[PDB]
Amino acid sequence: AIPAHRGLITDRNGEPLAVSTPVTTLWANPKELMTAKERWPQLAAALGQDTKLFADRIEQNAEREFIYLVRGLTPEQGEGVIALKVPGVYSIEEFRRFYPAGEVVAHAVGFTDVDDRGREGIELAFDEWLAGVPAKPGKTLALSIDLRLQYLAHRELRNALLENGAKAGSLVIMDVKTGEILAMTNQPTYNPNNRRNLQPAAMRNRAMIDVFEPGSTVKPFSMSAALASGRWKPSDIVDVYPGTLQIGRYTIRDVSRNSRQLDLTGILIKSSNVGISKIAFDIGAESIYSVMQQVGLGQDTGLGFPGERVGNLPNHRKWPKAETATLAYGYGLSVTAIQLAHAYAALANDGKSVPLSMTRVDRVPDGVQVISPEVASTVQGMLQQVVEAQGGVFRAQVPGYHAAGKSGTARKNAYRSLFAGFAPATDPRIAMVVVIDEPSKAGYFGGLVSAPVFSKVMAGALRLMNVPPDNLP
Ligand SMILES: *[B@@]1([O])O[C]([C]C([O])=O)[C][C][C]1[N]C(=O)[C]C1=[C][C]=[C]S1
Numbered sequence: 001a002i003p004a005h006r007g008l009i010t011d012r013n014g015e016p017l018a019v020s021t022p023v024t025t026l027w028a029n030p031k032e033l034m035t036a037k038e039r040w041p042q043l044a045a046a047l048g049q050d051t052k053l054f055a056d057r058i059e060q061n062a063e064r065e066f067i068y069l070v071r072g073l074t075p076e077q078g079e080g081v082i083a084l085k086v087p088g089v090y091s092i093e094e095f096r097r098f099y100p101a102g103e104v105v106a107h108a109v110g111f112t113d114v115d116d117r118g119r120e121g122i123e124l125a126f127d128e129w130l131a132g133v134p135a136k137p138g139k140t141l142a143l144s145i146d147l148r149l150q151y152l153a154h155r156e157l158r159n160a161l162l163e164n165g166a167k168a169g170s171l172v173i174m175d176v177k178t179g180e181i182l183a184m185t186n187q188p189t190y191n192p193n194n195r196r197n198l199q200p201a202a203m204r205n206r207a208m209i210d211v212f213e214p215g216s217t218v219k220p221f222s223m224s225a226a227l228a229s230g231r232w233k234p235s236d237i238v239d240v241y242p243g244t245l246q247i248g249r250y251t252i253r254d255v256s257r258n259s260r261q262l263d264l265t266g267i268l269i270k271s272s273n274v275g276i277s278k279i280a281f282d283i284g285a286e287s288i289y290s291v292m293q294q295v296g297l298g299q300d301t302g303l304g305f306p307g308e309r310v311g312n313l314p315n316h317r318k319w320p321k322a323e324t325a326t327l328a329y330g331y332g333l334s335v336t337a338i339q340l341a342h343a344y345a346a347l348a349n350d351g352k353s354v355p356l357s358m359t360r361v362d363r364v365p366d367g368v369q370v371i372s373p374e375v376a377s378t379v380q381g382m383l384q385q386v387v388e389a390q391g392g393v394f395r396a397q398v399p400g401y402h403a404a405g406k407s408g409t410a411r412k413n414a415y416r417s418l419f420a421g422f423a424p425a426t427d428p429r430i431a432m433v434v435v436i437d438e439p440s441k442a443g444y445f446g447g448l449v450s451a452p453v454f455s456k457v458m459a460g461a462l463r464l465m466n467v468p469p470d471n472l473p
Contacts, residue, residue, distance in 0.1 A: 001134045001135075002134055002135035003092070003093070003094050003095060003116065003134055003135070004131065004132035004133060004134045004135045004136060004137055004138060005020050005095060005132065005137035005138060006018075006020045006095055006097065006112070006116055006130055006131060006132070006137075006138045007129065007130040007131075007132065007137065007138030007139045007140050007141055008020075008140045008141070009109060009122060009123075009130070009140075009141050009143065010140065010141070010142050010143065011105075011142070011143055011145050011146060011147040011150070012142060012143060012144055012145060012146050012180070012182075012360045013146065013147070014142070015101075015147045016100050017099065017100070017101055017105055017109050017143065017145070017147070018097050018098075018099055018109055018122075018123065019097070019098045019099075019100065020095040020096075020097065020116075021095065021096050021097065021098045022075055022093060022094075022095065023071075023072045023073060023074065023075070023078075023093075023094045023095065023096045024072075024073045024074070024075055024077065024078025024079075024081075024091050024092075024093065024094070025068065025070070025071045025072065025073070025091070025092045025094045026047075026068075026069040026070050026073065026078065026081055026089060026090070026091055027066055027067060027068050027069060027089075027090055027091075027092065028058070028066075028067055028069050028088050028089050028090070029065055029066065029088040029090070030058055030061050030062045030063070030064050030065070030067060030088065031062070031065055031088065032087050032088025033058050033086070033087070033088035033089070034058070034062050034088075035087055035088070036086055036087045036088065037055075039084065039086040039087070040054060040055055040058065042084055042086075043069075043081070043084060043086050043089065046077075046080055046081045046084060047069060047070050047081065048070075069089065071094065071114065072094065072096050072114075078091055094116065095116050096112075096116065097111060097112045097116070097123070097192075098193060099111070099192045099193055101147060101150070101151075102191050102192065102193055103154075103189040103190060103191045103192070104147075104150060104151055104154045104185075104189075105145060105147065105150050105154075105185075106121075106189050106190055106191070106192045106203075107120075107121060107184065107185070107186050107189065107203075107204075107205040107206075107207070107208075108121055108122060108143070108145055108150075108181075108184045108205075108358070109121050109122050109123065109143075109192070110122055110123040110124055110125075110192075111123055111192040111195065116131075117131070118130065118131075120203065120205070121205060121305065122141065122143065122358060124305070124306055125303070125304055125305050125306070125358070126141050126359075129141060141359060142359065142360040143358060143359060143360065144175075144178075144180035144181045144182065144357050144358055144359055144360055144361065145181065145182065145183065145184070145358075146182050146183065146464065146465075148464045149173055149182045149183040149460075149461050149464055149465075150182075150183045150184075150185065152183075152457060152460040152461065152464070153171045153173060153183040153185045153457050153461075154183075154185045154189070156171070156453055156456050156457045156460075157169050157170075157171045157185050157186075157187055157434075157453065157457075158187055160434075160436060160449070160450075160452075160453045161187045161436065163441075164417075164436060164439035164440065164441050164449050165439065165440035165441055166187075166436045166437055166438055166439045166440065166449075167437050167438045168186070168187055168188065168206055168210075168436075168437040168438075169186065169187040169206075169434075169435060169436045169437060170184075170185070170186050170206045170207040170210065170337040170433070170434075170435040171183065171184075171185050171207075171337075171432070171433070171434050171435075171453065171457060172184050172207050172337050172338055172340075172341040172432065172433045173341075173430060173431075173432050173457070173461055174341045174342065174344075174345045174356075174430070174431045174432070175345075175429070175430065176345045176346075176348040176349040176354075176422060176428050176429060176430065176431050177349060177354065177364065177429070178354060178357070178361045178364050179342075179345070179354035179355050179356050179357050179361060179364075179365070180357050180360070180361050181338070181341075181356065181357065181358050182430070182461070183457075183461075184205075184207050184208075184338070184358075185207075186204065186205060186206040186207055188201065188202045189202065190202040190203055205305070205307075206337070206435075206437075207336065207337040207338055207435075208301075208303075208305055208308050208309070208336055208337075208338050209307055209308065209309045209336070210309070210336065210337070210435075210437075211309045211311040211312070211334040211335065211336055212334065212335065212336075212410065212416055212435070213330060213331050213332075213333065213334065213410045213416075214297070214330045214333065214335050214340055214408060214410075214418065215329070215330040215331065215408040215409060215410040215416075215418065216271040216329065216330055216406060216407060216408040216409070216418075216446070217330060217340060217406050217407070217408035217418045217419075217420045217433075217446075218292060218297065218330040218333070218335075218340075218343075219267070219268060219271065219276050219328075219329060219330060219406060220268065220347065220379055220382075220383060220406050221288070221291045221292050221295060221297070221343065221347075222276050222279065222280060222288050222291075222327075222328040222329070222330075223264060223267070223268065223276070223279075223379055223382065224291050224347070224371050224375050224376070224379050225283055225287040225288045225290070225291045226264065226279045226282075226283055227264075227375045227378055227379065228287070228291070228371070228372060228375050229282075229283040229287055231282060231283060232264065232279060232282075232283070233264075234263065234264045234265055234378060234381075234382060235263055235264075236263065236264060237261045237262065237263055238261070238262055238264075238267060238272075238274075238275045238278050238279060239260055239261055239278075240254060240259045240260065240261075240262055240267075240270075240272045240274040240275045240278075241259065241260040242257060243256065243257025243258070243259065243272075243274060244257065244274065245274045245277060245278070245325075247277075247321045247322050247325060248321070248322065250322040250325075252273050252274055252277050252325050252329075253273065254270070254271075254272050254273050254274050254275075255271065255409075256270055256271075256272075259272065262275050264279075264382065265382045265385045265386070265389070267279070268382055268383070268385075268386050268406065269385070269386055269389060269391055269392050270391075271406075271407070271408075273325070273329040276325075276328045276329045277324075277325035277328055277329060279328070280324050280325055280327070280328035281321065281324060281325075284319070284324070285316065285319035285323065285324040285327055285328070286319065288324075288327055288328050289313065289315060289319075289327065291370075291371065292313055292327075292333065292343075293313055294353070294368075294370035294371075295342070295343035295346045295347070295353060295370055295371070296339055296342045296343055296346075296353065297311075297313055297333060297335050297339055297340070297343055298310065298311045298312050298313030298333055298334065298335060298339070299313070299339070301336075301338055301339065301342065301356050302355060302356065303338070303356055303357075303358055305358075308336075309336055311333070311334035311335045311336055311339065312333060312334045313333050314327065314332050314333060330408065330410075331410070337433045337435050338356065340418075340420050340433045341420070341431055341432070341433040342356055343420075344405075344420045344421065344422055344431040344432075344433065345422070345431040346370050346371065346376075347371065347376055347379060347380065347383075347422070347431075348380070348404075348422035348428035348430075348431045349367065349376075349428065350373045350376045350377065351369055351370060351371030351372055351373050351375065351376030352367035352368065352369050352370070352373075353367055353368045353370045354367040380404055380422075380425060380428070381425075383404035383405055383406060383421065383422075383425075384402055384403070384404040384425040386404070386405065386406055386407075387402075387403050387404055387405055387421070387425075388402070393405065393406075393407050393419070393446075393447040393451045395447060395448065395451040395452045395455060396419060396421060396447070396451040396452075396454050396455055397455060398423050398455055398458045398459050398462070399459060400459075400462075400469040400471055401423045401424045401425070401458075401459075401462060401467075401469060401470055401471055402423065402424055402425030402426055402470055402471055403421055403422075403423040403424070403425060403454075403455070403458060404421055404422055404423065404425040404428075405419055405420055405421020405422065405451075405454060406419075406420055406421065407419050407445065407446030407447040407450065407451055408420070408446045409444065409445050409446045412437075412438070414438045415438065415439065415444040416435065416436070416437055416438075417434075417435075417436045417439055417444060417445065417446045417448075417449035417450045418433070418434070418435055418446045418450055419432075419433070419434045419446050419447070419450035419451045419453070419454045420432070420433045420434075421454055421458070423458050423462060424462070424467065424469075424470040425470070426470050427470060429462070429465065429467050430458065430461055430462065430465070430467075432454055432457060432458055432461070434450040434451075434453045434454050434457070435450070436449050436450055436453070
């Protein structure tokens with residue numbers, strides 16, 4: 001069988017991400033090798049193998065009319081072995097993958113196994129498109145990924161992990177208009193060109209497989225349900241005093257407890273679990289579940305990355321009050337960073353969900369209106385206030401632009417620090433999620449740990465895409 005040329009993977013602008021490299025596999029007709037034993041030591045040397053074990057191997061398989069000697073030698077090493085002119089030694093031309101961006105886009109692109117077959121990421125997901133048929137060559141695949149945004153994201157997430165002594169992290173950037181993933185980076189990462197002795201830990205595409213309680217980052221969807229109910233406007237007040245609320249044996253507790261009356265923007269700025277719980281009791285869990293289901297939290301992303309986790313959105317016929325509250329302030333559900341980014345992309349795109357893509361989108365599919373454009377517009381303004389208002393997430397602010405977003409912190413006393421947002425706030429182009437796992441320095445809150453990463457990556461990302469500054473006189 002004639003091994004086919006595996007199709008080129010590029011970024012959205014044709015930068016090479018995975019290239020088929022010529023290599024040499026050497027096989028032997030032992031029957032013919034057994035006629036030239038005096039050549040074996042020179043041949044053993046040229047293969048790196050020991051003289052004795054090489055000789056043991058060939059003697060044992062002297063019946064077989066075929067065995068492999070070595071796979072995936074460089075052509076140069078291959079020519080050296082052919083230059084020995086040993087009877088019973090023949091060469092096949094094979095293809096191994098090289099990844100020029102290396103660790104920068106490891107998780108997204110993935111890699112091939114020993115047989116030039118997709119084992120991780122896009123290599124696995126689009127294996128049939130890229131492989132061709134062993135012989136017709138495989139087809140070029142242009143990713144949605146912008147290598148320029150990917151490098152910035154990679155660099156800033158790495159610097160955030162080190163500055164906070166964190167064990168892991170994820171950053172996803174999405175085009176809100178096209179459903180395209182512009183960047184997807186995880187720490188820790190690995191060099192896919194050197195897979196000799198490296199942990200399955202480093203190879204985990206956390207953005208797509210790590211499921212977590214999103215906490216306060218889904219309070220905006222609870223608020224979308226509130227504004228869509230006809231019962232709530234942004235200027236309405238909730239009494240959250242004294243920052244706790246008993247629901248049978250369950251006690252809802254706010255992290256900050258020096259508030260009485262908050263307006264709905266204030267509930268988001270303070271991330272008040274009591275405030276959102278009381279709104280949830282009024283509107284019913286069904287309306288909150290429905291919005292979260294529709295923006296894709298705990299739902300199949302359709303990206304068909306094998307080992308992709310879907311997480312869980314809990315459902316009930318009759319919602320108990322405790323489950324109603326915990327859903328509303330973002331516990332009792334499990335999501336991935338890609339789902340959260342996708343949910344924020346729909347909010348940012350005036351309530352319209354466009355299907356997620358890891359490949360360059362030339363013809364944008366029709367979106368689903370999952371939140372009414374007026375509710376989406378209102379929730380955008382409130383999330384702009386969360387970043388810009390007194391006591392807000394000022395570290396999320398993006399010089400030259402109106403940014404909008406929401407911090408989160410969950411307990412796993414280890415913590416998960418989250419920031420999800422989009423910019424520019426008036427004409428959203430980009431949604432971003434930053435997840436940092438177990439920050440080990442003093443500040444562990446989303447607004448302290450993850451928000452500065454959002455600021456710098458978003459600042460860079462908007463400039464690389466030549467988005468015009470929207471904070472003018
Ligand atoms: B929410 O996930 O995040 C808020 C903080 C933020 O926005 O970064 C606080 C309320 C929510 N988190 C919790 O109630 C869980 C915590 C327990 C102790 C500290 S965070």
